[PDB]
Amino acid sequence: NSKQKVQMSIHQFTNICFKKCVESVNDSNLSSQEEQCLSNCVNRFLDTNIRIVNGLQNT
Amino acid sequence: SKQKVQMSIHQFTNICFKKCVESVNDSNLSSQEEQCLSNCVNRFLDTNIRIVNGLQNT
Amino acid sequence: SKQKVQMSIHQFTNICFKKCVESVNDSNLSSQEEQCLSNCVNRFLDTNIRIVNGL
Amino acid sequence: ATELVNKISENCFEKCLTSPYATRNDACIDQCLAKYMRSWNVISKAYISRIQ
Amino acid sequence: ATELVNKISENCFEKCLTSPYATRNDACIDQCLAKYMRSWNVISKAYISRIQ
Amino acid sequence: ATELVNKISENCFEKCLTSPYATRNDACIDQCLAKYMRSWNVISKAYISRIQ
């Protein structure tokens, strides 16, 4: 791996996904719903990257 | 400035794509969205000049 | 200091201008949108401190 | 050339997927990619025709 | 164009122009520029007055 | 390192404060910070489990 880059991406993903999944701050606890949205969001984002990069070669 | 062509085109594309493409249903640009896309770039460039002129005017 | 001040002012301006300047139809800032503008900067700085202390 | 990848990803993520992001939707991404590259071409054309 | 120039352009583009972007609107941009520089002044003033 | 601080600030600024930016909503910021760091943990976990 690369310790430095491992952090890098996590910051960016967190920044994108937090906006999209944390709709409001009323308690300090993450709900069931917003925790799963958060991990789906990251995965779905990675899936997109691969789809895009694969697609940029073939085509 | 063979690199600065890419760098701007990337950025304009990013701004204009958001503003002119209201949905992805086919892999094609319609006429309306194609003209919006070129207007958007031109209008943007016009703005830059107006701003920079205005900054040295002031 | 010299450069770093400008860079913050640029970004604060960029954030706050969006949030406070709703519709342009003259070149004057009103009394209201002027106070929103200065509040916005202060409130932003307060937030930074709260966050960094908290971290 | 590689940051590009991230911007398309963002743009296409916003238009093809929604909270809670359960269902993967690759038909929409492919289209969105295609649509994106066509947009790029039009903008670069418009842009260059302006630098005389 | 410098970092500042581009951000004003973006801000004023958003507030003075709408799709399909056929019709230019220079009067609005000039105002928006003026209004932008006044905003800058107010923010820098507020900012410096808070450096202790 | 410090870049993080600014992004949390932006995110929490957007969710806790709305123009006219009159009053300090500190209770909300604290929560938002707490909620932000929990989000970070979940993403890093999801992320690392992917790269296996």
From Swiss-Prot, chain B:
Listed GO biological process terms: protein insertion into mitochondrial inner membrane
Subcellular locations according to the entry: Mitochondrion inner membrane; Mitochondrion intermembrane space
Keywords for this protein: Chaperone, Disulfide bond, Membrane, Metal-binding, Mitochondrion, Mitochondrion inner membrane, Protein transport, Translocation, Transport, Zinc
Signal sequence residues: none
Recorded topology in the membrane: Peripheral membrane protein
GO CC list: mitochondrial inner membrane; mitochondrial intermembrane space; mitochondrial intermembrane space protein transporter complex; mitochondrion
Main location: mitochondrion
UniProt KW Mitochondrion keyword: yes
GO molecular function: metal ion binding; protein transporter activity
Disulfide bonds: 16-40, 20-36
Highest taxon in the source lineage: Eukaryota
Tagged with keyword Glycoprotein: no
Motif extent (Twin CX3C motif): 16-40
Subunit structure: Heterohexamer; composed of 3 copies of TIM8 and 3 copies of TIM13, named soluble 70 kDa complex. Associates with the TIM22 complex, whose core is composed of TIM18, TIM22 and TIM54. Interacts with the transmembrane regions of multi-pass transmembrane proteins in transit.
Note on domains (UniProt): The twin CX3C motif contains 4 conserved Cys residues that form 2 disulfide bonds in the mitochondrial intermembrane space. However, during the transit of TIM8 from cytoplasm into mitochondrion, the Cys residues probably coordinate zinc, thereby preventing folding and allowing its transfer across mitochondrial outer membrane.
Family to which the UniProt record says this protein belongs: Belongs to the small Tim family.
Chain's role: Mitochondrial intermembrane chaperone that participates in the import and insertion of some multi-pass transmembrane proteins into the mitochondrial inner membrane. Also required for the transfer of beta-barrel precursors from the TOM complex to the sorting and assembly machinery (SAM complex) of the outer membrane. Acts as a chaperone-like protein that protects the hydrophobic precursors from aggregation and guide them through the mitochondrial intermembrane space.
Protein name in the entry: Mitochondrial import inner membrane translocase subunit TIM8
Species this protein is from: Saccharomyces cerevisiae (strain ATCC 204508 / S288c)
UniProt lineage: Eukaryota, Fungi, Dikarya, Ascomycota, Saccharomycotina
Whole-protein residues included: 29 to 86 of 87
From Swiss-Prot, chains D, E, F:
Disulfide pattern: 12-32, 16-28
Gene coding for it: TIM13
Protein name: Mitochondrial import inner membrane translocase subunit TIM13
Family designation: Belongs to the small Tim family.
Domain remark in the UniProt entry: The twin CX3C motif contains 4 conserved Cys residues that form 2 disulfide bonds in the mitochondrial intermembrane space. However, during the transit of TIM13 from cytoplasm into mitochondrion, the Cys residues probably coordinate zinc, thereby preventing folding and allowing its transfer across mitochondrial outer membrane.
Outcome of substituting residue 32 to S: Abolishes import into mitochondrion
Annotated keywords: Chaperone, Disulfide bond, Membrane, Metal-binding, Mitochondrion, Mitochondrion inner membrane, Protein transport, Translocation, Transport, Zinc
Example GO molecular function: metal ion binding
Record motif Twin CX3C motif, residues: 12-32
Assembly information from the UniProt record: Heterohexamer; composed of 3 copies of TIM8 and 3 copies of TIM13, named soluble 70 kDa complex. Associates with the TIM22 complex, whose core is composed of TIM18, TIM22 and TIM54. Interacts with the transmembrane regions of multi-pass transmembrane proteins in transit.
GO cellular component: mitochondrial inner membrane; mitochondrial intermembrane space; mitochondrial intermembrane space protein transporter complex; mitochondrion
Superkingdom to which the source organism belongs: Eukaryota
Species of provenance: Saccharomyces cerevisiae (strain ATCC 204508 / S288c) (Baker's yeast)
Biological processes per GO annotation: protein insertion into mitochondrial inner membrane
Compartments, record wording: Mitochondrion inner membrane; Mitochondrion intermembrane space
Function summary: Mitochondrial intermembrane chaperone that participates in the import and insertion of some multi-pass transmembrane proteins into the mitochondrial inner membrane. Also required for the transfer of beta-barrel precursors from the TOM complex to the sorting and assembly machinery (SAM complex) of the outer membrane. Acts as a chaperone-like protein that protects the hydrophobic precursors from aggregation and guide them through the mitochondrial intermembrane space.
Complete-protein stretch covered: 46 to 97 of 105
